Amino acid sequence: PVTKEDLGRATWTFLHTLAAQYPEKPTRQQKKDVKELMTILSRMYPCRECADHFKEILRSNPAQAGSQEEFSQWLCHVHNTVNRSLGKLVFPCERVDARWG
Amino acid sequence: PVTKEDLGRATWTFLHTLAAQYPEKPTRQQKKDVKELMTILSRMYPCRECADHFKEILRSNPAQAGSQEEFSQWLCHVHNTVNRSLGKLVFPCERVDARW
Ligand SMILES: Cc1cc2nc3c(=O)[nH]c(=O)nc-3n(C[C@H](O)[C@H](O)[C@H](O)COP(=O)(O)OP(=O)(O)OC[C@H]3O[C@@H](n4cnc5c(N)ncnc54)[C@H](O)[C@@H]3O)c2cc1C
Ligand SMILES: Cc1cc2nc3c(=O)[nH]c(=O)nc-3n(C[C@H](O)[C@H](O)[C@H](O)COP(=O)(O)OP(=O)(O)OC[C@H]3O[C@@H](n4cnc5c(N)ncnc54)[C@H](O)[C@@H]3O)c2cc1C
């Protein structure tokens, strides 16, 4: 049950939905939790290789949690790096808000 | 157009899979990360009411991450508590390593 793909789809839904709700002017804690959440995922994501790649991506592209727009975009760019590595379509990050409300 | 219900299903799939892959003998960091992960969720979970409900549950049921079995079990109970309040069927918590 639950393949690498099912996990990915579920998590992206959670992450992008989360970035869709992120506040315009986040508090110091909300900013901290978002960054901590990504760090935790870089170590804990339930798919070995996937977690290593996320770790790399996170190293070179730290989370932009300054606001809803920066986080939504950042998360979309991160998702695209994975898409590209897998030979999948690359999503236009100007439409993230249209895809995730 | 993700719904409150699609968010929930996605999240439980993530959590439960995470709890199914948790190590038998977690390190000090892994225990810490899993715990902080639940705390982050109770503040950050999208649906407002849902965040507050989960926050009260975590209050009286602090996360147990001493091992895969304990974490799986704790997560399973914390989920039945939610199903219950929603009028849903209860999942027997010996069957966690089943759905996940
Ligand atoms: C943190 C993380 C790291 C991952 N790393 C790997 C890896 O190293 N190797 C591996 O094999 N798998 C990895 N995966 C899995 C992978 O990214 C896929 O989820 C899986 O292959 C299924 O692809 P899918 O085509 O159904 O679309 P996903 O990539 O799962 O799609 C979610 C859906 O969201 C949308 N979407 C697509 N791109 C974006 C975007 N840029 N922004 C907003 N929405 C978008 C589309 O509607 C799409 O169908 C990872 C998943 C996560 C959550
Ligand atoms: C932390 C958290 C808090 C939530 N709080 C609320 C809330 O306050 N209000 C609200 O309207 N919604 C809330 N939700 C959403 C809700 O719990 C549902 O996810 C949603 O209603 C969809 O229900 P579903 O019937 O598809 O099953 P879910 O409850 O999403 O099911 C996941 C699936 O996992 C299984 N499963 C069921 N019970 C267990 C268990 N005890 N252990 C292991 N697996 C189980 C079954 O196979 C089931 O179909 C929350 C979600 C999360 C992740």
Swiss-Prot record, chain A:
Entry GO MF terms: flavin adenine dinucleotide binding; flavin-dependent sulfhydryl oxidase activity; identical protein binding; thiol oxidase activity
Effect of inactivating the gene: Embryonic lethality when homozygous.
Catalytic activity: 2 R'C(R)SH + O2 = R'C(R)S-S(R)CR' + H2O2
Primary residence: mitochondrion
Cofactor(s), by name: FAD
Transmembrane segments: none
Assigned EC number: 1.8.3.2
Keywords: Disulfide bond, FAD, Flavoprotein, Mitochondrion, Oxidoreductase
Subunit structure: Homodimer.
Task of the protein: FAD-dependent sulfhydryl oxidase that catalyzes disulfide bond formation. Oxidizes thioredoxin in vitro. Required for the import and folding of small cysteine-containing proteins in the mitochondrial intermembrane space, and can act independently of the oxidoreductase MIA40. Can oxidize the cytochrome c oxidase assembly protein COX19, a typical substrate of MIA40.
Protein name, per record: FAD-linked sulfhydryl oxidase ERV1
Originating organism: Arabidopsis thaliana
Residues of the full protein shown: 73 to 173 of 191
